[PDB]
RNA sequence: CUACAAGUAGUCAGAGCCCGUUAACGGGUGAUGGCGUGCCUUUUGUAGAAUGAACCGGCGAGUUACGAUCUCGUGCAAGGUU
RNA sequence: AGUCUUGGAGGUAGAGCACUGAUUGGACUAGGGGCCCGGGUUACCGAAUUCAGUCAAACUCCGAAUGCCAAUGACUUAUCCUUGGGAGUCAGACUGCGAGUGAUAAGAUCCGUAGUCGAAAGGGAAACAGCCCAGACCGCCAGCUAAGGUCCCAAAG
RNA sequence: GUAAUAGCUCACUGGUCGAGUGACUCUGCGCCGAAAAUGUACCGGGGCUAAACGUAUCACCGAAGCUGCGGACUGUUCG
RNA sequence: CUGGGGCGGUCGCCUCCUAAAAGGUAACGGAGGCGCCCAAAGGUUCCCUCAGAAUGGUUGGAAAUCAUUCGCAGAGUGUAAAGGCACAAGGGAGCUUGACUGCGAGACCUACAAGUCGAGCAGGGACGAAAGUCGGGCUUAGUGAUCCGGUGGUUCCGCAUGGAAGGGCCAUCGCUCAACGGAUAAAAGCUACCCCGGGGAUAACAGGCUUAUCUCCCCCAAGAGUCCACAUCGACGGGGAGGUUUGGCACCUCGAUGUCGGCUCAUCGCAUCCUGGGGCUGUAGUCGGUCCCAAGGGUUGGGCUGUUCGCCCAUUAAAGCGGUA
RNA sequence: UGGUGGCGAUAGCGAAGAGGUCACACCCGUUCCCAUACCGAACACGGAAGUUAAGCUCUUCAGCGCCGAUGGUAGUCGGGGGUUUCCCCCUGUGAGAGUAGGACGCCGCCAA
């Protein structure tokens, strides 16, 4: 459950996930990676689920290199409450994702193993994905 | 040169700016032929509209 | 039903209508102001003066022109006929 | 004119039938077809399942005095008026 | 007033890391261990530095489109200013776009912007204030079209 | 498969047989995933395998738009 | 004010974001500050330039002070932030009080009230040789009307005249009047004993939109299951349906839509409780579990509680879940 | 050469070299003007024995920094469309980054 240690503002606007990514569109730390085909917010619980999934499938395998970090916080008012009276309290932390963006990489491991692990992770994630490799 | 301009389409539901460009061309009714000269200003104007208008250079 | 409150972030100052007030190539009278600001986004130039509020005014009549102090720094000036 | 037809009730088209005018592309009915959710208020918006009216008739709501001001007009004009 | 031209201010979108903050991995390493004789080894941790990489409404080395302000003339269009008399309005709605709050839920709410309704009938969307097309002096048993449509309800393949 | 074994299979190999047969990327249109309450009930209906979808072409219909003809009024310029 | 009201919180001013590249722009939107301070922290003249790092060096120490090279700026700028400033607006020294009087072309902002800038003229000065700068501070907040009184000054008036009282003009003081454009110099509560005028402009029921929540279904599958993921369960995570819950919004209804439970009357859906027909099984049989098709019919009587719900007794093939204001 | 001004560091940083009889500097001493919170470092005052080392000028370079195209892309006014927390099509516009490359200076006035 990743966390930014320190932040300026505990409360931010949400934002808009228009367009494609700026960077991180291609694997370069590792060999076999995964990228997105949509745009969405992703949570520390999602990423750690995917991470531990692939690492359990691999059991010693090489290196991973996540390519993101949930910097963004997201609020949520308490339950059964009218509107207004200030912005809701923070709940967790979020990473924002554009399409064309690489999320997880892999090295030290064969292609079939990598593809299967990333499949497993994709099923923990909400969005549509693609298997990718380095050029 | 000269050119005729006609309202292929109406202004209702269009912004004031291009509505007034039309009225400045001298157009009050649909399918209204109006003559002007092949001046760059007017050409820029009909470019600014370009979707209410049909044009016929003489 | 529940009960909540205490936003304590609910104010802001009165908007002060900064920016330029006259344009390049525009004729100007003596004493007219040109660019309200805070500090110097823009400096004065010829026949132009700064006030205690860092505001720029024309000392004479003339025409306005904005330019640059060489690099990354701007200027105004009034040039008469 | 009407007893296999649904209709804010009319309108337009229209056959048949009956008449014959303030004599003119006339009148009364109207099978049948098409279109069509009343009036007023108040509303962002009412056919409105929001309000009011059973119906008919009558009565029933922005005026008068004084003063100010504007316009128009008339008369007289650096003088007008009681 | 509109357009064309010219010149301006303005730091948004976008993009980027030069600042501030957040952040991934690697290299080296101060230093601190554990191991041997003040040293001598360790990949046991490891500062800073460095390489490469991601991110930002309250961060910018940069920076548009549009819009805004003016000048010149050109073309076109006629509404503009002042003074005075008289008002009404200050419950707005939806739609599209950009934003916020919300759960990037609401025919939600609140702002900006353009339109329509309001105050606008007509044709289509089955019906259907706000959508698409389009603006009603009146008549005509004439015609050309828009949106939308052409097997029958229902005009047209 | 056995408690272990055993046993059965398989990879793989050779033989017969005589033409295609197997992995992947992208992409169009589709299938499942798919349940609710007076009655088919998310084409308006009939019904449609073209009367659907996609591209292109020409025709036609289609409004109180526009035009034509004729009247009324207002305004501007000279009836 | 209020996403009904009440309670809470706030009420004026300044800075930033939201704000959509002029300006402006809301919300019980996000972050922070003010109700001052300096008689030098002002003016002028002249001077020079920071923070940190590495070296060396008692006490000196990681960290004073020290020389030392690196060093646009990482410091400072009275205070919050933004803008801006290193040719200084930052830091020192000398002399001084322009933190002046009368004014003010012309501009900005603006409903008004008001607020802001301002060259330049006169008088008298300060610093400087001189040019020349100085009408407070680096700019932006640091404050409030009028009436009423008070103080000082005044070639103003002073009810027959002279004076006077008193008033006027000028300067100035007195208010968290903070609910900060201030209703009074002067003011808290209950009403279920209540009343009038209005409202669906605004709440409770129901309806509607949404579906966070609720119920149900599903995906990946680690793992449990002696072995074995998928007989049955299914973690961390993910995606949907429904519109029976708690709710959110306020769209009809306040010129009246009666609101829990129960009785009678039924009716519909099926995500089926039984009955019927099947697949799989960690199904020997009997009984079962789970899943699939099936809504034809049926789906108990009592005790307690107003109760719904629920617990209990005894039965039943079974004692279904819901919708219909 | 020296002085003095103008133009966005295309002027700078950095490395390497060359020159100074004139000139500019460095440099020699405080008796006076004046000064150093310490003082002749600096500021002032006077001087010119020697030094091109430094500063200053002139050459070189493209390591740093700086400038900077074209094309393409994002974005986008406008128009239109669609399975619409977004996406797509069209006229037009059009960056940043990354390149190509440019550049270790251009222009003036005075004095010998």
UniProtKB/Swiss-Prot annotation, chain A:
Listed as disulfide-bonded, the cysteine pairs are: none
Pfam families to which the protein is assigned, alphabetical: Ribosomal_L16
Q: What does the record list as GO biological process? A: translation
One GO term in the molecular function aspect is: structural constituent of ribosome
Kindly list the residue ranges recorded as spanning the membrane.
none
Coiled-coil features, chain-numbered ranges: none
Subunit architecture: Part of the 50S ribosomal subunit.
Q: What does this protein do?
A: Binds 23S rRNA and is also seen to make contacts with the A and possibly P site tRNAs.
Q: Which HAMAP family match?
A: Ribosomal_uL16 (MF_01342)
NCBIfam families, A to Z: rplP_bact
PANTHER family cross-referenced by the UniProt entry: 50S/60S RIBOSOMAL PROTEIN L16, LARGE RIBOSOMAL SUBUNIT PROTEIN UL16M
Protein's UniProt name: Large ribosomal subunit protein uL16
- This chain's source organism reads Bacillus subtilis (strain 168)
From Swiss-Prot, chain B:
* Gene Ontology terms for molecular function: structural constituent of ribosome
Recorded superkingdom: Bacteria
Please name the Gene3D superfamilies in this protein's record: Ribosomal protein L30, ferredoxin-like fold domain (3.30.1390.20)
Cite the PROSITE patterns for this sequence: RIBOSOMAL_L30
| Pfam families assigned to the protein according to its UniProt record, in alphabetical order | Ribosomal_L30
The Gene Ontology CC terms held by the record are:
cytosolic large ribosomal subunit
Q: Which InterPro entries match?
A: Ribo_uL30_ferredoxin-like_sf (IPR036919), Ribosomal_uL30_bac-type (IPR005996), Ribosomal_uL30_CS (IPR018038), Ribosomal_uL30_ferredoxin-like (IPR016082)
**Family, per entry:** Belongs to the universal ribosomal protein uL30 family.
- UniProt cross-references to HAMAP family, sorted A to Z: Ribosomal_uL30_B (MF_01371_B)
Q: How does it assemble?
A: Part of the 50S ribosomal subunit.
| Name of protein | Large ribosomal subunit protein uL30
This chain's source organism reads: Bacillus subtilis (strain 168)
UniProt lineage: Bacteria, Bacillati, Bacillota, Bacilli, Bacillales
State which gene encodes it.
Answer: rpmD
Swiss-Prot record, chain C:
Keywords, A to Z, come to: Ribonucleoprotein, Ribosomal protein
Q: What molecular functions are annotated in GO for this chain? A: structural constituent of ribosome
Q: Does the keyword Ribonucleoprotein apply?
A: yes
Disruption-associated phenotype: No effect on sporulation at 37 degrees Celsius, however sporulation decreases at 47 degrees Celsius.
BP GO annotations:
translation
Give the intrachain disulfide bonds: none
Q: Which Gene3D superfamilies match?
A: 2.40.50.100
How is it modified post-translationally? The N-terminus is cleaved by ribosomal processing cysteine protease Prp.
PANTHER family linked to this entry: LARGE RIBOSOMAL SUBUNIT PROTEIN BL27M (PTHR15893:SF0), RIBOSOMAL PROTEIN L27 (PTHR15893)
Which HAMAP family does UniProt cross-reference here?
Ribosomal_bL27
Q: Note the subunit structure.
A: Part of the 50S ribosomal subunit.
Instruction: State the protein's purpose.
Output: Plays a role in sporulation at high temperatures.
Tell me which NCBIfam families the record gives.
L27 (TIGR00062)
**Stated name of the protein:** Large ribosomal subunit protein bL27
């Amino acid at each position: 459950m990743l966390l930014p240690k320190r932040v300026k503002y505990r409360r931010e606007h949400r934002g808009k996930m228009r367009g494609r990514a700026k960077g991180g569109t291609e694997v370069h730390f590792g060999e076999f990676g995964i990228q997105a085909l949509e745009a969405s917010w992703i949570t520390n619980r999602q990423i750690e689920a995917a991470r531990i999934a692939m690492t359990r499938y691999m059991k010693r395998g090489g290196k991973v290199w996540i390519k993101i970090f949930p910097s963004k916080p997201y609020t949520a008012k308490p339950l059964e409450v009218r509107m207004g009276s200030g912005k809701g309290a923070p709940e967790g932390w979020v990473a924002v994702v554009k399409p064309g963006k690489v999320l997880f990489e892999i090295s030290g491991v064969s292609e079939e193993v990598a593809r299967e692990a990333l499949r497993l992770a994709s099923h923990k994630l909400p969005i549509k994905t693609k298997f990718v490799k380095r050029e | 040169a000269k050119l005729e301009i006609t309202l292929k389409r109406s202004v209702i539901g269009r912004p004031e700016d291009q509505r007034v460009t039309v009225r400045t061309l001298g157009l009050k009714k649909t399918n209204q032929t109006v003559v002007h000269e092949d001046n760059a200003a007017i050409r820029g104007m009909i470019n600014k509209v370009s979707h209410l208008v049909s044009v016929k250079e003489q | 039903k529940k009960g909540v409150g205490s936003t304590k972030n609910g104010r802001d100052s009165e908007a002060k209508r900064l920016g330029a007030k006259r344009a390049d190539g525009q004729f100007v009278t003596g004493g007219s102001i040109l660019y309200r600001q805070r500090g110097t986004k823009i400096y004065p130039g010829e026949n132009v003066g700064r006030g205690g509020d860092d505001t720029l005014f024309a000392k004479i009549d003339g025409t306005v022109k904005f330019e640059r102090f060489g690099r990354d720094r701007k200027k105004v000036s009034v040039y008469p006929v």
